[PDB]
Amino acid sequence: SMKLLFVRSPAAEAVMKKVIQNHHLTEKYICDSAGQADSRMRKVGKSRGYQVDSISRPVVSSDFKNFDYIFAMDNDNYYELLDRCPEQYKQKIFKMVDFCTTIKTTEVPDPYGEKGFHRVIDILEDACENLIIKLEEGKLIN
């Protein structure tokens, strides 16, 4: 199993799970998140086919060892993660939006209007669809 950790991130996990299930790769990929989900995000996500239901847990050190890839939703998580990450694992850490190909964004935005919840899911659909394509081709390179 390839293990993906998302660190807005309950939404990332839910979108990525659905994308994996669409390509029938559920046996090959497990998703998790870290560091009850927003009731509005749950409603909106559900209307677009995504089951947003993660118990919000914290990133711990063993996550850097246990997961194969770790995806930050914005730039500040990204450098925070790197600053925290053992040297040997630093290559596992990616920005989510680096997988976008049609939305021209530099971070996943924090949703504040209510179109804001849709915009987060739009960005995640694009990035997650491309991320699964890349994961299937081989090592993630960036």
User: Helix segment count?
Assistant: 5
Per CATH, which architecture?
Answer: 3-Layer(aba) Sandwich
Distance between the termini: 22 Å
For the record, what CATH class applies? Answer: Alpha Beta
Oligomer: monomer
Q: Which strand order does the major sheet show? A: 2-1-3-4
Largest sheet: 4 strands, parallel
Q: Could you give the count of β-strands?
A: 4
Number of domains: 1
The ordered string of helix (H) and strand (E) elements is EHEHHEHEH
Strand fraction band?
5-15%
Indicate the structural class.
alpha/beta
- The radius of gyration is 14 Å
Shape: globular
Q: What would the CATH topology be?
A: Rossmann fold
Helix content: 40-55%
| The CATH H-level homologous superfamily | Response regulator
What does this molecule look like?
The chain is built from five helices and four strands, in the order βαβααβαβα. The chain is of the alpha/beta class. It has a single domain (1-142), classed as 3-Layer(aba) Sandwich (Rossmann fold). It has a four-stranded parallel beta sheet. Helix 1 (9-22) crosses helix 5. The longest helix is centred in the C-terminal third of the chain and has 23 residues, at 115-137. It is globular and about 40 Å long. This is acid phosphatase. Its EC number is 3.1.3.2. InterPro entries: LMW-PTP, Ptyr_pPase, Ptyr_pPase_sf, Tyr_phospatase_low_mol_wt. Residues 2-134 form the Phosphotyrosine protein phosphatase I domain. Pfam families: LMWPc.
